[PDB]
Each structure stands twice: as structure tokens, then as C-alpha cells.
């Protein structure tokens, strides 16, 4: 006959939506230890033999995990920082001498008038008949808070490790699009290095495909899903801020000072970006090979834009400073890019919650790689704004499963009767 | 630092084995269910959320040890019974599955019948054998 | 307004004694391992989560509920150059767990998968007769 033998420790699993925990390698960065646990000793891997498993990067929750975490881990270092209400006054702002930088004047924000400031053009808004006068762009909307100056901004090579009873899986097939099953599967204790890099229209400091380029989308027979393309051979970018800046902290309200911009040592020159015009041309022609598969043959050339300056420009960070680059001229050997530096931003496009940038004195220049692009057809035109699909650029393999340990199977062994 | 290949079949390693073959890695799966390797290297320097995930993992563990305690099978890993099989669950015979099929597929044959198995193991193996004690 | 001397034993009282004198003392270190502004609660889970692990490893080895037990795993003389009666009559435990610290991982794998895994497939198939 067949008696049912209990088996504890059998390795099967469901799929579970659960909570992971961040592990960052290792001063006073917000990602250093006030969000995560310290340095990663070693990532592991066990590769599994005879196993098939489906995957999806659009029904995934790890990609929803950062968007529910970086919205708040960024927010943690914004509660104690200095709110700036009393600056919202009449802003008599006239042009700087050697007019996208305006010398402003306003009555005093004292602890006890006719004070002074000068700052960027894209944070003022015009008002009624007394011309050459302005106001901030968010007063009658919501609050505005400057960053604390002792706060870092560098994306850190994080490692999502996995908690108890939860194994992170990883497919390894080179021929893996955004969906479908996989065969060469493997289990890790912990993910590889991921850096939290914020970008529109592109993909900065990401990760490289295996000497190839493969676009990914789910409903690409719609205009619904964003066609996201990874790039082999990162294109190096150079972006500068040549204006040798000065700062000061003039007094704000009862017992506080407000970090603004002093005088611009060195005359007014536009901060721009560079890209080698040879490499960009060949790189697009790599993609249209793969576009031919989902279609001299360069039927696609066209660019579009329109709407949000977060989306119209090219938004990213550099040295703790936000950029907004014009990208129409680049799409269609160095290439100068007109790139704007706004100072009052919106953090993850949420209505109301605004953040003010620290005006850094001196000069700023940074360089970076590029591993991917953002496109929308109907021919392909660059999208931007959806922050979550930046995160899907990395986690297009992984998965979180819950271990069921326990199982049964019949056999020809019966429990002997106790005497 | 170097490292030679495994000769002891690490975590989830025999997931492709047959049911008569993956039984040799039952010990590795059970040990690392609880807390994994210990993370959080005493760095308490600066919440609430953290510890709910820590408390659930114990409750997942204590669910099963009590359930093996009712099933007369605490401490063991493999134990027999007095319950015969009912082939309406799955009539698939012995070597059709045993030396032919992994564990992920055997669970996808018995998942509809799961709670039905648990009452029968409870009653006719220990609620039964409580009436043999005397 | 109280006080009398020691009667049975103390907590960690045998931790300078020999193995042959500490082996009759294990219960006092066995009882008080578990019983004893959020930061009390974060202690009250780590004290649990350490107890289950040591309980779990005894469970896998066919040695749950006993304080001591034996296996059939052979001691390997490569692990210890110490003589037998030096161990049971001269060495304390605190010294002893600095000497076999490196080999400990080899030991625990060579209990489960060596024997108590193997003592179930052998055990289940002693039926049919």
C-alpha cells in the first residue's frame, strides 16, 4: 500500500510580496548608515541545475520598493532642515552686470530693511503693473525648504540582501527580454551593486549588457509601455559649471541665516555639456538593428518634446547640483549643449513638497557614463518623468520568493505500532 | 582568497533533483530558514518597521514545529504514519513521479488537496494513537 | 535581613572547572538562557532568535530534548593533537572553544549530512518486512 510520509525541509516556494533590507558599502551621507546597514562583506551565488521559472519586470515589487523608499529616505533629511517662508515677498529683481541672473532686493527678514540677493532666473515669476518685480514660483502653492549643507548626495553601490525565509532568484540567460521563463537560474544571498541615480530621458551610471544592445518592452505593439534600451560601450559625458561662484548666508527671520549666492567671480558664461559626436552616431545605429527586428535602414529619426521642464529638458544631478539640458539638438567632435541649472526643484513630481538647492561656491565639473536610453514611438521620441522605470533598468532579472519547507509524498513504509 | 567547488550541495541546490534524490539536502534547507546567516553586525548607531519582519519569521518557524508536534513528528525530518493514501488526490503511481519529477511539480499536483491532508494526519495518527495509550 | 551560603551551584559557576566537573552542571546554564524606550523589546527578540537557533541545530542532529547525546560521526585526530585524559581532566571549556573554533563549520556539516540525514533514508527503508 501507500502511506503518507511527512517531509520537512523540501525546497519549494511561492511568490511573495514582502520587505527587503538595504545594505550599503562603507561621512554623514544620508545613504551611509542612517538608511542602511554597513558594509557588504561578500555576495554569494548558487547556480541551480534543472529548474525553469517565469519572470516579469513589470509585475515586480522590488522596482516598487525603491519608489516607496527613496521617496522617504530622501524625506528623512528634510524634516529638521530650515524651512523658508518669510522670503516670499515683493522681489524687485533687475539684471546682473557683466539677464538670466537677477539682482534682487526686499525688506529684511530679521530677528528684531531693503536687503539684497541674486539667484537664477527660473525661480521667479512676474507680477502686476510695478514692473521689474517678481515673487517665488511656489508661494501660493506650498512650502519650500533648503537642504542642510552637511548632507551628501552620492549614489552608493547598494546591495539588497534577503531576509529570513526569502531567497532572491536570478536568471542568467543572455537571450532574456523583459518577460518569459528562464533556464540558467541561480540563487544569491544578495544583489549586486545598484546605485540610486536620478535621471530623465537617459540612464546615467547604470549597467552594461554583454557586448550587445537589446531593447525591452512589454506592450510594444502599443504606445503603452516605454521602450527602454540598454547600451553596450558607455558614452562618456563631460559637464561643467565654469562660473566661479561665491556664497553667503544672510539672516532669515528670527535667529537663522539663509545660504544664497554672493558675487560671480569671473564673467557670465553658460554651463554646458560635452559629448564626442563620433560615438553617438554609431550607437544609435546599433539600436535600429534591433528596431528592425521589431519592424541605410534608418526610417526612424524624429524628436519631440513638450510640457514639463522636468521632461522637456534633460534632468540629472552633478556634484549635488541639478541640471536641465536641451536634448532636441542632440537627438536627430565635441558637442556643446545648452544646459540649464534650476535651483528650486520638485522631488519625485509630488504636488507641493518642494526642495531648494544649496548654492555651491567655486566651480563644478563632473563626468559620467551612459548605459541606456528612453524612447516612445508614435518615429521614436524620447520620453521622461516616470521615475520607476529607472529602477526597472537594473532589476530586470531578480525576484523574491517565500520558502515553503514542508511537504508530503506516499510511500510503502508504515509507522510501527508502539508496543 | 580562493575557493574550490562545493561538495556538500548548498542552499536550494537540489531543486532540480528527483524526489528520491533531493532528500539528501533536507538539512541545509531547514537550518537556513531561520534568520539566514546573521546580518545586522551590532550597528545600532543613529523606527518600528525593521522589527515586524523579524517577529514573523519566528512565527513561520513556530507554526511548523508545533504542527510537527501535533503530527507526532517533532525533531525528525522524515517520519512515517498509519494513514493510507487516497488516490483521488492524485492516482499517479510510484516511479511515475519519484524517479521522474522534482518537488516544485509535486507541489503543483497536491496544492488543491493541502488542508484536506492536514486533518487526516492530525486525527488518524495522533488523535487516533491517543486512544491507544491506556 | 537574610542570607545563607551556596547550596547547589551558581550561574557560570563551573566555567573555571574541568570538563569532568562541569559536565554535571549544565542545567543552570540551560535554564536561565531565556528568562532573565523601545530598546528592551529589541533585546527581547534577539534573546529569542538566539535560542531558537541553538534549539534548531539540536533538532536536526537527532538530539532534541536531550542535554547530551552521542552520534556515530568519528572524531578525527587531525582536529586535536590533545591526549584523551588531558581533555577530560585538565582543560576548561573556555580554553577548549578557542582550540576547535576553526573546525566548527566542518563539524556541523559532518553531523547532519553525514549521519542524521543518512539515518533516515536508512531508517525509512527498514520497513517492508
Amino acid at each position, epitope marked *: 500500500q501507500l502511506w503518507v510520509t511527512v517531509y520537512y525541509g523540501v525546497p519549494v516556494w511561492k511568490e511573495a510580496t514582502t520587505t527587503l533590507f538595504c545594505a550599503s558599502d562603507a561621512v554623514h551621507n544620508v545613504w551611509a548608515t542612517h538608511a542602511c546597514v554597513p558594509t557588504d562583506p561578500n555576495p554569494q551565488e548558487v547556480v541551480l541545475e534543472n529548474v525553469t521559472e517565469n519572470f516579469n519586470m513589470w509585475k515586480n515589487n522590488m522596482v516598487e520598493q525603491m519608489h516607496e523608499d527613496i521617496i522617504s529616505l530622501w524625506d528623512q533629511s528634510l524634516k529638521p532642515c530650515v524651512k523658508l517662508t518669510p522670503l516670499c515677498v515683493t522681489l524687485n529683481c533687475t539684471d546682473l552686470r557683466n539677464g538670466e541672473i537677477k539682482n534682487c532686493s526686499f525688506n529684511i527678514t530679521t530677528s528684531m530693511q531693503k536687503e539684497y540677493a541674486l539667484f537664477y532666473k527660473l525661480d521667479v515669476v512676474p507680477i502686476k503693473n510695478d514692473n521689474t518685480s517678481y515673487r517665488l514660483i511656489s508661494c501660493n502653492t506650498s512650502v519650500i525648504t533648503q537642504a542642510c549643507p552637511k548632507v551628501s548626495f552620492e549614489p552608493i553601490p547598494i546591495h539588497y540582501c534577503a531576509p529570513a525565509g526569502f531567497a532572491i532568484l536570478k536568471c542568467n540567460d543572455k537571450k532574456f527580454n523583459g518577460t518569459g521563463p528562464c533556464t540558467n537560474v541561480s540563487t544569491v544571498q544578495c544583489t549586486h551593486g545598484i546605485r540610486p541615480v536620478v535621471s530623465t530621458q537617459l540612464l546615467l551610471n547604470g549597467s552594461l549588457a554583454e557586448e550587445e544592445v537589446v531593447i525591452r518592452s512589454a506592450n510594444f505593439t502599443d504606445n503603452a509601455k516605454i521602450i527602454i534600451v540598454q547600451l553596450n560601450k558607455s558614452v562618456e559625458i563631460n559637464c561643467t559649471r565654469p562660473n566661479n561662484n561665491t556664497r553667503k548666508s544672510i539672516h532669515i527671520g528670527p535667529g537663522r541665516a539663509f545660504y544664497t549666492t554672493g558675487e560671480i567671480i569671473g564673467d557670465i558664461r553658460q554651463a554646458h555639456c560635452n559629448i564626442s559626436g563620433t560615438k553617438w552616431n554609431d550607437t544609435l545605429k546599433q539600436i535600429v538593428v534591433k528596431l528592425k527586428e521589431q519592424f541605410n535602414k534608418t526610417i526612424v529619426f524624429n524628436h519631440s518634446s513638450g510640457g514639463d521642464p522636468e521632461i522637456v529638458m534633460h534632468s540629472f544631478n552633478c556634484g549635488g547640483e541639478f541640471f536641465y539640458c536641451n536634448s532636441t539638438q542632440l537627438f536627430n567632435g565635441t558637442i556643446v549643449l545648452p544646459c540649464r541649472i534650476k535651483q528650486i526643484v520638485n522631488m519625485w513630481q509630488e504636488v507641493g513638497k518642494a526642495m531648494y538647492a544649496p548654492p555651491i561656491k567655486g566651480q563644478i565639473r563632473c563626468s559620467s557614463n551612459i548605459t541606456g536610453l528612453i524612447l516612445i514611438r508614435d518615429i521614436f521620441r524620447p520620453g521622461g518623468g516616470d521615475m520607476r522605470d529607472n529602477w526597472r533598468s537594473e532589476l530586470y532579472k531578480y525576484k523574491v520568493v517565500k520558502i515553503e519547507p514542508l511537504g508530503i509524498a506516499p510511500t510503502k513504509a508504515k509507522r510501527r505500532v508502539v508496543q | 582568497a580562493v575557493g574550490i567547488g*562545493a561538495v556538500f550541495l548548498g542552499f536550494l541546490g537540489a531543486a532540480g533533483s528527483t524526489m528520491g534524490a533531493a532528500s539528501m539536502t533536507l538539512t541545509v534547507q531547514a537550518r537556513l530558514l531561520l534568520s539566514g546567516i546573521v546580518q545586522q553586525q551590532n550597528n545600532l548607531l543613529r523606527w518600528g518597521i525593521k522589527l515586524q519582519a523579524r517577529v514573523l519569521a519566528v512565527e513561520r518557524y513556530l507554526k511548523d514545529q508545533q504542527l510537527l508536534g501535533i503530527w507526532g513528528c517533532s525533531g525528525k525530518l522524515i517520519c512515517t504514519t498509519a494513514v493510507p493514501w487516497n488516490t483521488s488526490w492524485s492516482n499517479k503511481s510510484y516511479n511515475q513521479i519519484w524517479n521522474n519529477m522534482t518537488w516544485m511539480e509535486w507541489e503543483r499536483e497536491i496544492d488543491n488537496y493541502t488542508s484536506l491532508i492536514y486533518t487526516l494526519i492530525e486525527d488518524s495518527q495522533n488523535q487516533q494513537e491517543k486512544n491507544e495509550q491506556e | 535581613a537574610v542570607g545563607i551560603g551556596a547550596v547547589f551551584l551558581g550561574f557560570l559557576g563551573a566555567a573555571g572547572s574541568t570538563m569532568g566537573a562541569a559536565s554535571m552542571t549544565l542545567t543552570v546554564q540551560a535554564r536561565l538562557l531565556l528568562s532573565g524606550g523601545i530598546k528592551q523589546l529589541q533585546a527581547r527578540v534577539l534573546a529569542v532568535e538566539r535560542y531558537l537557533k541553538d534549539q534548531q541545530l539540536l533538532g536536526i542532529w537527532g538530539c532534541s530534548g536531550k542535554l547530551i547525546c552521542t552520534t556515530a560521526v568519528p572524531w578525527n585526530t587531525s582536529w586535536s593533537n590533545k591526549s584523551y585524559n588531558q581533555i577530560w581532566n585538565n582543560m576548561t571549556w573556555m580554553e577548549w572553544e578557542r582550540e576547535i573554533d576553526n573546525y566548527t563549520s566542518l563539524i556541523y556539516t559532518l553531523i547532519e549530512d553525514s549521519q542524521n540525514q543518512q539515518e533516515k533514508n536508512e531508517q525509512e527503508l527498514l520497513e517492508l518486512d
Partner: antibody
Amino acid sequence: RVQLVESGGGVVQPGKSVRLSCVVSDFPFSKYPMYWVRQAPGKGLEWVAAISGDAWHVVYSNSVQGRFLVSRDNVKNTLYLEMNSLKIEDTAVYRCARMFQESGPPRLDRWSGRNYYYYSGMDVWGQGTTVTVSS
Amino acid sequence: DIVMTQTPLSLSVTPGQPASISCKSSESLRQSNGKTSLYWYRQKPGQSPQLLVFEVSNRFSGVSDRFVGSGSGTDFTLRISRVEAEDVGFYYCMQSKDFPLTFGGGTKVDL
């Protein structure tokens, strides 16, 4: 003092195979990894090979795989390197090297089920020995 | 795999000099145990190599008190104050993060 002495030197023709020797002094040697380094006649230095104190694991460089063979004998306190299928451009001076620390036994990772030997830098060489491949 | 460089190698000296030579590598070679793999050796010409520094700012015992190296991450420097007449030879930088092991040219030192 740990006085590593090196011997077995020989100058031959290409296509042949020779073997060196490295003997130690005042030294337990059962728990110590060894190395082999290469001073080409005008060059700086480059690592060749490595062995455990167990003589269980042997890592090489990319080049001499399928040419060399390292083997300890802690009874003899003597290291062998039978260098099969010599090249002419591998004419150099070869040495042995005690590791800086004492290595230990492997510690088995409980999760991976996968051993890990530990190898660090070296501190004490021998006097040098000569192998030359010419015609 | 992982490689590294040195300074201009030939550096004539002065008795009582702050001599310093960097060795920038293509990796942050900090191991899992927090021990930074770095090994400064030296050979006089006609001699075997000889250990100077076994880890970042850790002189090897039995060697005199004038050899204070440093470094972190990619770049690693070896500062020597009180330059003497027994300093002639080459300086060998060494990785120990992962096999294979590398070295450098060996910075020439004369008067």
C-alpha cells in the same frame, strides 16, 4: 630564523622539463602556503604559482597552465616544481616564498557549502636558483 | 587582472629627505575582512627582495623606524623620511586582492 634554501637549478634546451627544489629551516611548514616568482633578466617581477599548506589547491597564472606542476611534501619540507614543456622566453630566476602569516585550515561557508582557502602576501624568500632555456 | 602603476622610477636622493612614491591601482582592494591588500618590498641590486611594509601604515618588524607608508582605495603611497645611504635599489608594489598577483617596474634609487 626561517632560512628558505633553494636548489635544483639547471640550464637546458627548449622542449625539455626540469625540476627545482626549495627547503626551509627551523620551520613547521605544514600550515604555510608557498609561491613562485619570476625575475626575467631585466624585468621587474611577476607571480607564477601558489599552493596551500594542505597541498590540496594550486592556482597558477594563465600562461603556464599545462606546463607546470607544484607539489609540497611537508615530511621532506621540500617543494617541487616539474616544469614541463619549457619556452625560451621563460628564461629567468625562480624563487620560493613563505607566506607572511601562518595560514589556517579552510573555513566552510555554511550557506554556499563551498570552501574558501586564504592566501596573503609573502615575506621571506630563498637565495634564488637558475633555470635558463637556450640552445 | 587588476593592475597598478608607479611614479617616475629613478629618483636620486638627499640624506634626510621625505621620499614618497605612490602606487595607484585600478580597484579598491579592500578585502572582506577590512584588511587592505598592499605589500611594499625592496631589493638592493644583486640581492633577493626584502619586505618593508606589509599593510597600509604598518611597517614590518625587524626593519627600522623610518618607513611610513599610507594610502586608501586606488592610490597608495610609501613615504620615507630620513633617507640614508642604504636605500639603493628598487621598490616593488604588490596587490593581494585577487589572483593573479601583480608588481611594478621597481623604482630606481641612487644618490
